[PDB]
Paper text:
As presented in the taxonomic analysis, Bacteroidaceae bacterium MAG57 encompasses a remarkable number of CAZyme-encoding genes including a gene cluster targeting arabinoxylan (CC102), an abundant hemicellulose in secondary cell walls of sugarcane and other grasses. This cluster encodes two exo-enzymes from families GH43 and GH97, and an unconventional GH10 member with an unknown 45 kDa N-terminal domain. The GH10 domain of CapGH10 exhibits endo-β-1,4-xylanase activity, being active on both xylan and distinct arabinoxylans. Combining the biochemical, structural, and mutagenesis analyses, we would define CapGH10 β-helix domain as a CBM, therefore, establishing a distinguishing structural scaffold in this superfamily and founding the family CBM89.
To get further insights into the potential role of this unconventional N-terminal domain, its crystallographic structure was solved by SeMet phasing at 1.8 Å resolution. The domain behaves as a monomer in solution and exhibits a parallel right-handed β-helix fold, consisting of 14 complete helical turns with two main short helices protruding from the β-helix backbone. The 14 helical turns are twisted and curved with a calcium ion between the 11th and 12th turns in an octahedral coordination sphere. Neither the catalytically relevant residues nor the active site topology of these families is conserved in the CapGH10 β-helix domain, supporting that this domain is not catalytically active. In order to elucidate the molecular determinants for xylan binding observed in AGE experiments, two surface regions populated with aromatic and acidic residues, typical platforms for carbohydrate interaction, were identified and mutated. The region I between the turns 1–4 and the region II near to turns 6–10. Mutation D344L (at the calcium-binding site) also affected protein stability, but the arabinoxylan/xylan binding capacity was preserved. This result indicates that calcium ion has a structural relevance rather than a functional role in carbohydrate recognition. Only the mutants Y62A and E82A, affected the migration pattern in AGE assays with beechwood xylan and rye arabinoxylan. Both residues are located at the region I, indicating that this patch plays a role in carbohydrate binding.
Residue numbers in the entry: 26 to 446
The structure:
Amino acid sequence: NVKELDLWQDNTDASYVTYANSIRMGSNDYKVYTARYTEFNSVVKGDKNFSLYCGGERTWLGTKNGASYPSWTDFKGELHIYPYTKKSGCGFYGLLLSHGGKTFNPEDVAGSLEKTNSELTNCTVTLHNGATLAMWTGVRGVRIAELNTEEGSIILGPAKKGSGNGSYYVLGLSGNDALLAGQIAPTGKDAATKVGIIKEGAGTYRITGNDNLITGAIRILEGKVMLNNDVETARTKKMAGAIGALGSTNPGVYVFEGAAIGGTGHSASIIDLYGNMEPGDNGIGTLTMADFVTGKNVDLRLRPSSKLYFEINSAEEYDKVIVEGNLNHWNIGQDFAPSDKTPIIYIQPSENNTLKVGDRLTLISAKGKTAREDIKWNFRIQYPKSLTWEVEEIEENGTYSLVAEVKSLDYSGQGEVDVDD
Ligand SMILES: [Ca+2]
């Protein structure tokens, strides 16, 4: 049944509550109520529900200042993080993850991992409405196999502002899909304070918040991220969307080779596309790049390895990319070596499509086409094994479009060439 650890007390920085007795859950769910200042430093083993009701902004999983953390690798259950607002006026109500004196390098993820807090890699974690999940100062990482957040929750990153403070949440190792519906943004929306997501594993993470500011960017190493915020509302009300705006230099999304970005919402930051772009979410949709808050151009940064997949049901229903900015091709690969290979467009009619001769599909619309070093480039096209196509790259009235036109319902062999060789 249930064990309850009620550790709450109206305490201060000078009277921390510390609980460190090992827990073997057995057949019991646990419910733990923490004080504002709490060191929850118990080794936990079991496969039951562990619910952590956090009484303030100094409840640590581990010790003060994130100096150490207990073993949770034998915890295989569900960790649920809730607020507990009995003590009012706190900066936030949630859990501070520890770093164990270790620093994370977002540029060398593989080399950072084996010394990063990886205790929550055999369980699931759910961050509930009103709860915050934060880290301390410095540049820190945590590996969480499966994280879902509810609307009204906050992935904060560092508990305090600073250019030297950065928090990277390495999510997805379970291989399962998850939903980040709560906010992802640093304290005070401070632009210099970094909070980042690093996506690994085979599954897809869906991001739906409309007021994010992912200052440490999303780095997609494996699987997919869908930006599924309410873009129509974000346009009208001038909201940040799923990413927010990082400016004209730093990408908000790095899609590495083999991984994918997609969705029905929008990025207000540069997408650096080494990998795949799949508009919609396992189906037809429109993905937008646009900054509704500050009105600046947002470019799609294309690479020699870029691939863009367009599913097409009809002239009325097909995948679209809209860029309120330029298609900006960099002839530099993931390894910094030059290549003259250009992005591939995959034209993919559905199994029950109603395409007709003369249908013109505007797959990509942008303000312009640009390039590192002003080197001219065109998309390579992977045609399907049906119909006959003309692809038209059109610059007109100071705007750009990539159009696929159906010339015949008969097949003319255009799909026999495997472009990616
Ligand atoms: Ca699609």
